[PDB]
Amino acid sequence: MKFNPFVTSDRSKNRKRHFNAPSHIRRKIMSSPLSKELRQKYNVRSMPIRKDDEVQVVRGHYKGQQIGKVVQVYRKKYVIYIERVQREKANGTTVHVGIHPSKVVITRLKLDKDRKKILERKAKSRQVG
Amino acid sequence: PPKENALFKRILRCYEHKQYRNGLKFCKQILSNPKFAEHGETLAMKGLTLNCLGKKEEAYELVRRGLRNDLKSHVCWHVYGLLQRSDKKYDEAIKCYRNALKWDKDNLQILRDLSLLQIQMRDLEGYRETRYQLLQLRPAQRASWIGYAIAYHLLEDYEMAAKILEEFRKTQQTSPDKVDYEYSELLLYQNQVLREAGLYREALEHLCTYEKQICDKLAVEETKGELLLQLCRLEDAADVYRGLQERNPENWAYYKGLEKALKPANMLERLKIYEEAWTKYPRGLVPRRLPLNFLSGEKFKECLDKFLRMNFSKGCPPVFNTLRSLYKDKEKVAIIEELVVGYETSLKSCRLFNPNDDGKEEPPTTLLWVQYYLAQHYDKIGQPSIALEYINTAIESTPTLIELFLVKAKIYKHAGNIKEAARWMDEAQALDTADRFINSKCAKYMLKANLIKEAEEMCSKFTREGTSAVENLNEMQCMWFQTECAQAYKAMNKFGEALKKCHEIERHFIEITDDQFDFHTYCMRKITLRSYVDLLKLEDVLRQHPFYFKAARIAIEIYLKLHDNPLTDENKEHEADTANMSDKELKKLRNKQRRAQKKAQIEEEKKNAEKEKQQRNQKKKKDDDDEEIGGPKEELIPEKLAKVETPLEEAIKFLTPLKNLVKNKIETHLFAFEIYFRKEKFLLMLQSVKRAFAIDSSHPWLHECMIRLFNTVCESKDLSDTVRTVLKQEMNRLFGATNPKNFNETFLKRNSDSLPHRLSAAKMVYYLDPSSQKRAIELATTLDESLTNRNLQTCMEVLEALYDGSLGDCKEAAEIYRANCHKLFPYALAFMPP
Amino acid sequence: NIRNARPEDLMNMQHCNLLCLPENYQMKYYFYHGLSWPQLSYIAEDENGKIVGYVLAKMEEDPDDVPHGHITSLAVKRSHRRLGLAQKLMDQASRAMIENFNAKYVSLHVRKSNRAALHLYSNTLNFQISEVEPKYYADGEDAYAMKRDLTQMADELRRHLELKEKGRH
Amino acid sequence: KKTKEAVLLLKKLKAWNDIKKVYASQRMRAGKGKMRNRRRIQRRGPCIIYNEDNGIIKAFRNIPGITLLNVSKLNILKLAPGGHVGRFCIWTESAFRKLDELYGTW
RNA sequence: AACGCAGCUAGCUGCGAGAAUUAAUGUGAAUUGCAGGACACAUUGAUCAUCGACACUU
RNA sequence: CAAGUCCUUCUGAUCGAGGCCCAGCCCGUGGACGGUGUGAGGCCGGU
RNA sequence: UUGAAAAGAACUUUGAAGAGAGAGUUCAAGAGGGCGCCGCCCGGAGGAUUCAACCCGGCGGCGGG
Ligand SMILES: O=P(O)(O)O[C@H]1[C@@H](OP(=O)(O)O)[C@@H](OP(=O)(O)O)[C@@H](OP(=O)(O)O)[C@@H](OP(=O)(O)O)[C@@H]1OP(=O)(O)O
């Protein structure tokens, strides 16, 4: 049960902010869980998705064991693109299939200056508890 | 058609990534079309999908239907080949693969899988031809050259294997990398092939060119040392071996290399070799232990005095262990004994090793360690009372030292008291329950003390939760505990459980050899080819370990007992019980038995139902069974396993690895002799006797073999004369051609000083002449001090031989022998007076 | 004694680890260690040929991780304890580790109650606690992530190599 | 202080079967109530009636169906949830002894 | 209130000739219909938000 | 800034249906809500 | 207010086209761009933890000034 008087639980209100959200906010909902190996080593459960991360699909028709890299983070449609997540168009070309970030697992992170700082900040909050 | 072909590609895609259910769902619509209902390859793929789902028979039926629908379809034959390989039916898999190749000669997958098989069952010719075809098809792949070189290497043909190696290394000379660990491994493997060919000069020259390209300096230095020893460059070998010595002063191989390079003419120079070693490096226990292996006299006296002094000042445990080898010669025994007694007396008097020493007073812990050494020494010599009093004094002085206990264990177990030792080290494990060394050794003693339940309970303190200790230890292939459990089960005549343990050993050994199949594709990717070939030569000699020997001997003695006297009476007492039992009252008791058996059947059905479901919840939560499909091994049924239909045949499967690998030990040939004697194989009698004769012609059991064979050949008349001529030649050579009685007599005078030999001679005196039982009774019960190897172990074996009836009924003589041994061995429980 | 583990002996620490340490496994990563790194596993053998000590080490497979080793298992029997057998095993294993991989450090994991090995690693081998990972083992007791830098001894190893190469010429 | 001990407690009082019944009776409301924030409905469970608040509410408030009532302030809307009497209630020793002072005897 | 401002732009929206925005701060790799432009991301920066500096046609 | 995308099974996809040593999968001072290919305390934002 | 996702129907053929016929996508085009005979008894042939009465143990109901 939520006790904060200034946070609403209204269905329409919550939906409106989710569908009408600025991109920098949308990145926060653009979050995916790390695999067990990153989670144990980084002590972090979930991370926002990025343009180049090794990503594994765990739900849907394309669910499998193969590892792929994100190639586009389409924040407008709340989807991302991996290489081998494709289907065959009618004429003959090949198009990507949008997969929601919550339905994938990050197997390798785009280790970067801002990134490296992000994990240790989340991780150091764990030893607080 | 193109659409069904695309769906077929999706099916296999699903299979390679282990989406079995998607594959079967996709093939469902393929088989929906009547034009493809009988379609062979799709049915084969479906069946190969369900085989991974556990329905072996349905997979078999569907795959044979798909195969017969289109034999030309190499896909169906390949499917059947993976089907056979899926359940380790490799011999059918080779045939299915070759049948597939008759349709698709250039399928890379079929040929590579066939090559992996051909190395699995050692098809060197077939593997060589397969790798040659792969190399022709794919010369750019380094795997082709690697496998082609492997095939010739297993042939021991190192010349063309060598030129394949140097050509392939030139292909590796494309220079895409720095000094690569895999590249270093390839260079070392090529040097291995060169040195196995005896081409030591070119091997050394080649290695002398690529030192900068090898990270493994240890292998470079050891190879240089051995090659320079082979090339008579003694000084260079000495320099390389001294570099290794500075690299690792604790390895005997480098001292051996220094000895062979320097070639000390006499013992003084050999000692001077280690003098520099322990002056440059006084710390450690290596350069000083080695002289005691060859030192004799006063020089040995002073070096031993220094060794014991520094060890006692350090107060380390294993001092006794390292000098256990010096007990072979009794002069060293007397020297060490007088030294330690003098040390104890001097420490008691003035707390010094020697009263004239100028050093500081030694701690009382040094005296405690000296008493520990004394206890172990007198335990090994055969003076249980002195060792017991010394260990009691040590324990009273320092009750917190756990090592003082295990000495008491050694004393009691060598004195014949196993239960007291087991109880004392139950106490010792109570002292330190965190260490599993004491826990495991404790379990070993009450396994030797026949407290199997107690052993099982206390090992559970460290076993993984959710499983029984016995199931867990069988699962890790716990070798020693299983063998000791089998021996214990033999002690209370539980042949079924002991055979269950032995077959667990056999199953584990089968499990090791199939593990290499997964590694077939690993190290070739890793190019750790030295580790490859030496691992491969491991499994071909895998069953040479003494663990397999003890498991096999336990099983084979069980089978020999269950064939020579195969407990022929099985249910005859029950039939004889009802002979004097009236028909009406027989109906009474059989009706009560029917009630009891059917109630107990309902009972075991209901009770096993909750435990099977509980263990199901365990195993699924363990995730080991929650994801597990394959061919489950059949239950051993220890009760049924005890009533083995062909005991000798099972034991024969057991010696087959012994008969291929373990030929050095005489017991293998003796066991084959026993089995084939119960198989009336005189033609095998002579050869088994010959093999055992070639090892130890003076073995007591082997003399039993010769005698029994001679008597049986003399009495038997059904042998053909053509066999008789060669056989008569064989005894005229091996035997003295004299009567069995006189042959046994000659053996007994030749071995009148060894107690087991006298016991065997007495047994065959009784066997060849039951009227001659009394003289054998007197011969077997002698306990003169002049008898060699008359220790207590021989004493109980003679006692139970007398009890077993090998010399007939000798209860009074057995009791007298038991009392005399009790006088000799007061602490032996097997001689405790009635 | 300390010498390399020729996979004739990979069965022997399989014998020993069950006898000594509760952190036990099957034999599969035993072949994986022996085949991948035959030069990293070292053992101790008595005059009777029976194994009395061993070290089980492995290379980390993470490419982003800096080159550093990890020991899978290391134990010594009570009969041969306090001889520095574990210590000398660690020194020789680390020497081969640097020569064949040039690692910066070495990591491991240590039982909290195995205070004797804690003494060895801290006082004797100068190892330091990196992190604490609770419930790593099956019994749930916590373990220390233990690390020692291997740059410093690699320095004198390079010095010995230079001193031997100047002598050879 | 923690939910784990609260769950263990009423598991020892053999009242956990009601909580599972509340868990089983969790479904979507039928009608426009879904549009108006009343989306999930469930059966009401036992009442815990206390005297003093030393963390009792925080330990129990996360368990579905549990209602916390102060013995000094009873609520008929929570003792007879649908206007029907006979709700299962669990009392504390202190709260139980306060009933005589709160409502008296005859 | 009017009139203008987008590479392709009518309406809506935002903006004011610095005209679908400038500066600064926070954030940290996108925007997206297409193309182009970007993008060491600290020898410091796309987008978004905030908004205190600047600018704001009749 | 807590905890299941564990196993078997329904589906086009599922958040669906069963199971989860210890009387009971894991967290719960967190079982409000929203999103995510049905219906989700433990996938994500949050709470 | 299509569809989970445009995957928004390639290609062949008639027509000048609008429009069709095949084909294809999708779970779905029936979502194609303003698109959601049984109780007792008799007889026979059979089988079986078996019946009553006793002994032990447990549990209930009723009665005791
Ligand atoms: O010389 P023994 O008196 O016959 O003792 C040895 C010794 O026994 P301990 O284990 O009690 O010391 C061996 O052990 P180690 O000394 O090498 O440690 C043991 O073999 P394990 O190493 O496998 O224990 C071996 O056993 P076996 O005779 O079966 O070969 C045998 O002890 P037992 O005669 O008591 O079995």
Numbering used by the authors:
A (entry chain LY): 1 to 129
B (entry chain B): 7 to 840
C (entry chain 2): 2 to 170
D (entry chain LC): 162 to 267
Paper text:
As an attempt to stabilize NatA at the distal site, we added MAP2 to the NatA-80S complex and recorded a cryo-EM dataset. Indeed, concurrent binding of human MAP2 constrained the conformational freedom of NatA and improved the local resolution up to ~4 Å, without interfering with the NatA distal position. In the ternary NatA-MAP2-80S complex, neither MAP2 nor NatA binding is altered in the presence of the other factor, and there is no direct interaction between their structured domains. The first contact is formed by a long α-helix detached from the Naa15 scaffold (helix α34, residues 591–628), which wedges in the widened major groove of a protruding kink-loop of expansion segment ES7L(A) (proximal and extended: nucleotides 467-471 and 683-688) and also bridges a large gap of over 55 Å to ES44L. The second contact to the PTE is formed by the N-terminal TPR motif (helices α1 and α2) positioned in between exposed ribosomal 28S rRNA helices (H19 and H24) and the peripheral lining of uL24. While Naa15 contributes most prominently to the ribosome interactions, Naa10 also contacts uL24 in some of the NatA states that we captured (interface less than 100 Å2 calculated using PISA39). The structure of the ternary NatA-MAP2-80S complex now shows ES27L locked away in the ES27Lin position at the 60S/40S interface (as also observed in our binary NatA-80S complex).
